[PDB]
Amino acid sequence: PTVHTKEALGFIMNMFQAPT
Amino acid sequence: PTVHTKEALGFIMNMFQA
Amino acid sequence: SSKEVAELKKQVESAELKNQRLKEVFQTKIQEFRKACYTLTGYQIDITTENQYRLTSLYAEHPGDCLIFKATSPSGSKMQLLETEFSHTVGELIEVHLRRQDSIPAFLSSLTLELFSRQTVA
Amino acid sequence: SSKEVAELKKQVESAELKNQRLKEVFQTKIQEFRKACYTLTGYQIDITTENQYRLTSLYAEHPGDCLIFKATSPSGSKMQLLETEFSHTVGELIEVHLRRQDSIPAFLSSLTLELFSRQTVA
């Protein structure tokens, strides 16, 4: 995968796993 | 708010309904 | 300098690609994620433009049947059930699971099994 | 210093906190949506690193207790429950709600009411 994609996927996936 | 916040809010809110 | 121009031109291009990458990734993940919650929990949750949560059951008997919940304040997660037309038809679930048990999960679970068991072929 | 450079500096600044207020708005909203879905349905719903869905009950007995669902097909949403240490303990609920009724909502509802009823008030 391209670099900006990998950078974007890394930030958003973090959000979808965080405790609440 | 400031303008770029508003531009950001426009995009996201669309997808959190339907 | 033309060195500043070339460097700043990469930076503009780079930031604009990150924004496009960010927008198209987010849009994909929230739709999969929102569809995931609906298939699993049997409730479509959407943030109403008054920042409240509208819930529609997969087993709703009528279209437009829905529950609306209000967050009390950003700090913690206590929420209030607001008046909708559908709310009036389940005073007993509300009494038992919201007032007596103080559990929205118990409530939404009881409702789901109630609607599911009413959904017959004929 | 030059107009062409001065303008390109505005354009990077504009694209910097266009992405930077994009991430901070995604973050607040995703967390608000996911928290609402925690308080209402009594499940934390994660996207795993394998793009599968992990569910942890608000009434979980142990903190690592969870259900993992995989999306079978891209077209709409069917989901398969995968095997966890906790899924082993609810074969009864899996037989009635997943095998026979073919309803994940009915399953998760039953599971919430069973876990909620184990919570001591002391």
Author numbering:
A (entry chain D): 460 to 479
B (entry chain C): 460 to 477
C (entry chain B), D (entry chain A): 597 to 718
Paper quotes:
The Mad1‐Mad2 complex, which is required to catalyse MCC formation, is targeted to kinetochores through a direct interaction with the phosphorylated conserved domain 1 (CD1) of Bub1. Mad1CTD is comprised of an N‐terminal elongated coiled‐coil, followed by a globular head domain featuring a conserved RWD (RING, WD40, DEAD) domain. Each monomer contains a long N‐terminal α‐helix (α1) forming the stem, followed by an antiparallel β‐sheet of four β‐strands (β1–4), a short helix (α2) and two C‐terminal helices (α3/α4). Bub1CD1 is largely a single α‐helix, consisting of almost four turns.
In each case, the asymmetry of the homodimer was retained. In the more asymmetric complex, there is a more marked difference in Bub1CD1 peptide occupancy, with high occupancy for the peptide bound to the concave side of the Mad1CTD coiled‐coil, and very low occupancy for the Bub1CD1 peptide bound to the convex side of the Mad1CTD coiled‐coil. Electron density map of the second homodimer from the Mad1CTD‐Bub1CD1 structure (shown directly above) from the P21 space group visualized in Coot. The occupancy of the peptide on the right is extremely poor as is the density for the head domain it contacts. Thus, this peptide is likely to bind with higher affinity and to represent the single binding peptide in solution as detected by NMR, ITC and AUC analyses. This model is supported by our Mad1CTD‐Bub1CD1 structures from various space groups where higher occupancy of the second Bub1CD1 peptide correlates with a more symmetric Mad1CTD dimer.
